[PDB]
Design an enzyme around this catalytic site. Sequence first.
Site, mmCIF file in Angstrom:
data_model
loop_
_atom_site.group_PDB
_atom_site.id
_atom_site.type_symbol
_atom_site.label_atom_id
_atom_site.label_comp_id
_atom_site.label_asym_id
_atom_site.label_seq_id
_atom_site.Cartn_x
_atom_site.Cartn_y
_atom_site.Cartn_z
ATOM 1 N N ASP A 71 0.872 -1.139 0.000
ATOM 2 C CA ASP A 71 0.000 0.000 0.000
ATOM 3 C C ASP A 71 0.930 1.214 0.000
ATOM 4 O OD1 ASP A 71 -1.861 2.059 0.557
ATOM 5 O OD2 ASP A 71 -2.199 1.381 2.621
ATOM 6 N N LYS A 73 2.166 11.626 -3.597
ATOM 7 C CA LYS A 73 1.045 10.966 -4.258
ATOM 8 C C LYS A 73 0.088 11.992 -4.882
ATOM 9 C CE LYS A 73 -2.203 7.180 -3.597
ATOM 10 N NZ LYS A 73 -2.582 6.113 -2.607
ATOM 11 N N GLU A 106 -7.051 0.350 -4.559
ATOM 12 C CA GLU A 106 -7.101 0.243 -3.097
ATOM 13 C C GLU A 106 -8.408 -0.379 -2.561
ATOM 14 O OE1 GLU A 106 -6.059 4.143 -1.923
ATOM 15 O OE2 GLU A 106 -4.024 4.029 -2.763
ATOM 16 N N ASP A 145 -13.263 4.424 3.127
ATOM 17 C CA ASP A 145 -11.829 4.560 3.351
ATOM 18 C C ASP A 145 -11.542 5.965 3.814
ATOM 19 O OD1 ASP A 145 -9.056 4.536 3.372
ATOM 20 O OD2 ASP A 145 -8.796 3.584 1.454
#
Lengths: 383, 94
Positions: free
Chosen positions: A8, A69, A173, A197
């Site tokens: 991850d 990211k 994800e 999430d």
Amino acid sequence: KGPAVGIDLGTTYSCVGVFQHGKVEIIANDQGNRTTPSYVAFTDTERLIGDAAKNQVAMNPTNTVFDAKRLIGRRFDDAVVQSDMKHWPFMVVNDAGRPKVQVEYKGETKSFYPEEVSSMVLTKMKEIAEAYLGKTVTNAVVTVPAYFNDSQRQATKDAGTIAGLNVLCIINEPTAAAIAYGLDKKVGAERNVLIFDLGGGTFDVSILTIEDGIFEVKSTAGDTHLGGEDFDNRMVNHFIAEFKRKHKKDISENKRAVRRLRTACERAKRTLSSSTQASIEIDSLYEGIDFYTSITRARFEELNADLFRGTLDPVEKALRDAKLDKSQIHDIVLVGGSTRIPKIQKLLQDFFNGKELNKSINPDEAVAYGAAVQAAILSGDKS
Amino acid sequence: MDPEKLKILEWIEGKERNIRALLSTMHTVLWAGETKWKPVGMADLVTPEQVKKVYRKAVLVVHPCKATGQPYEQYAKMIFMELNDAWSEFENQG
Ligand SMILES: Nc1ncnc2c1ncn2[C@@H]1O[C@H](COP(=O)(O)OP(=O)(O)O)[C@@H](O)[C@H]1O
Ligand SMILES: [Mg+2]
Ligand code: NA
Ligand code: NA
């Protein structure tokens, strides 16, 4: 030969797992942590990554890099890049239309592409798995948000290649989390899965339909600027006023003291997920003054009341974009470190009318968990 | 009933995990649309080197990562899986 891992590669924290001997192991780093800050610190002597990087941020804000990211697979002149730049203390420049992180490393100005910076984090996660396995790691599955496009996917793969990894696949994800629960190994009619999430900087709701092991993203929703960091900030301001009341000093203007307070608030926050109060203890916070204080769960919850409850609008939004009713989703799965917050879990569960949540896998680990499962099957090491 | 699944099921069980038998007939079970795989004859499957060379090729074609979101996704994974077990069994030999 050696196993493949799941990584991850997260906005705020990264996590690595390996599927070995019939079980997935989420692997602790050398400081004892199962997740690792996606942070890269440059200094006069060394390059630091993870816990060591994040811990010296207060002292070294302009050469400590995070949120790469947010830059990955993007052009310098992307509106997202131009707005995000305002938040960061490190510098971002334009090399030929591409974003670069510019820092002072070893008394010389160096600049790095987003995928280069992410490679360093991936490298560290590679090392974490190698220390544990006692052997070198090459093959990985890496995860990426469902809404990522081909540029961001390719750039994430390239960050793998720069880390010395052969990326077996780039997967979503939410999908990895469903795989972590073995939801894709169920037979029969199509099932609807909802992924909730909430991480450190991003909030993602995905609805997937699974039938015969095949995923379809039906809809996504969320807020790319909503996560644990915001709940941290609510506490930070709460105590900036408190320090001003007790001491007639305002620390708002002192970068170092404010960060030092955020770190204590974040630690305090985690305590509130299992306990009902937490103590804060900072030596010499500001101009010689020790700060010691207490905070209840109730006080934490109400400092964040709006942000918590607004978390459900993206649920409703994804639910309508998917053209499904609340009753029609078969599995809800909790992902992301901030879903350990009790009030978020009640809040979600009460929206689904008491329906039980999939939460037995540590939420901040469920993504790497699923990636590890996938890496194994992709390598012929599972079933 | 799924005819493209039934054909892969039948292919799998007829070849009895013989890596060479599978590799030499994989073109008769690939989805319509598949264009990369040129059929192999036993003659290029004699040595272990040959079998290694061709299996790596076969695995690329039917790989589950590439097949994601494709109408043949399920069948690619059926083949890939049997290829891996045939190869692990080929490697147990000796
Ligand atoms: N027990 C906990 N209670 C509340 N928040 C937590 C807990 N554990 C981790 N967090 C928060 O989760 C966030 C990181 O989530 P994670 O899913 O690990 O990373 P990412 O958002 O990068 O995917 C941080 O805000 C962290 O403070
Ligand atoms: Mg995450
Ligand atoms: Na993460
Ligand atoms: Na998230």
